């Protein structure tokens, strides 16, 4: 029961529970990515740190959604967390491509829930996503795109390596 629920549709409540699952699955995927890069035969500790930090950010996003579900009077429901899609993640370029696909999927789930909230005339839900999630995703996807371009630059060629070093070491 709840004595607080007001203007909070059953459709939003259930979509919030699905989005918590998506963010906890993404956290799990980033935990697997992180520990893969800590393998002695892979040994890229900054790439491990990058993904382990993202694991923490996705768990915190799930926790914020769960706090909001209770603030609105909905009821958290948990489902199983699917294991990540790979057991080994390839090169840094493979891993960063998998990470941008994952973030694009989270961003589309946020936009779909925003559209539901707008259809349901739920401005608290719409502002919650705008304030705490939509720009976080735009900023992260921009960073990951910049990283993809620099990984390819570096692995690709002499001119690319040189251009990267000039930026990093002179400018």
Known binding residues for Fe cation: 53, 56-57, 60, 63
Q: Under rule CB under 8 A, which residues in 17-46 are in contact with a second copy? A: 28, 31-32, 35-36, 38-46
Contact between 79 and a second copy by CB under 8 A: the answer reads yes
Contact between 70 and a second copy by CB under 8 A: the answer reads yes
Nearer residue to a second copy within complex by CB, 57 or 164: 164
Whole-angstrom Cα distance, residue 118 to residue 48? 38
Q: Under rule CB under 8 A, which residues in 103-162 are in contact with a second copy? A: 104, 107-108, 111, 114-115, 118, 121, 123-124, 126-131, 134-135, 138-139, 141-142, 144-151, 153-162
Contact between 50 and a second copy by CB under 8 A: the answer reads yes
Burial 11-30 (b: 16+ CB within 10 A, else e): ebbebbbebbbbbbbbbbbb
* Among 18, 92, 98, 102, interactor with a second copy by CB under 8 A: 92
Q: Site size for a second copy, by CB under 8 A?
A: 95
Side-chain-side CA neighbours of 164 within 13 Å: the count stands at 16
Can you list the pairs that 79-86 forms with residues at least 24 positions away whose Cβ atoms lie under 8 Å? 79/17, 79/21, 81/21, 81/24, 81/25, 81/28, 82/25, 82/28, 83/28, 84/25, 84/28, 84/29, 84/32, 84/33, 85/29, 86/32
Contact between 90 and a second copy by CB under 8 A: the answer reads no
DSSP string, 27-62: HHHHHHHHHHHTSTTT--HHHHHHHHHHHHHHHHHH
Nearer residue to a second copy within complex by CB, 18 or 157: 157
Contact between 167 and a second copy by CB under 8 A: the answer reads yes
Contact between 168 and a second copy by CB under 8 A: the answer reads yes
* Among 15, 16, 66, 102, interactor with a second copy by CB under 8 A: 66
């Amino acid at each position: 029961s709840s004595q607080i629920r007001q203007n909070y549709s059953t459709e939003v409540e259930a979509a919030v529970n699905r989005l918590v699952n998506l963010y906890l699955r993404a956290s799990y995927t980033y935990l697997s990515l992180g520990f893969y890069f800590d393998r002695d035969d892979v040994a890229l500790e900054g790439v491990c740190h990058f993904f382990r930090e993202l694991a923490e950010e996705k768990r915190e996003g799930a926790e914020r959604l769960l706090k909001m579900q209770n603030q609105r009077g909905g009821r958290a429901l948990f489902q199983d967390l699917q294991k990540p899609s790979q057991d080994e993640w390839g090169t840094t370029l493979d891993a960063m491509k998998a990470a941008i696909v994952l973030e694009k999927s989270l961003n589309q789930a946020l936009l779909d829930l925003h559209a539901l909230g707008s259809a349901q005339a739920d401005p608290h839900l719409c502002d919650f996503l705008e304030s705490h999630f939509l720009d976080e995703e735009v900023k992260l996807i921009k960073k990951m795109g910049d990283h993809l371009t620099n990984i390819q630059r570096l692995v690709g060629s002499q001119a690319g390596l040189g251009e990267y070093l000039f930026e990093h070491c002179t400018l």
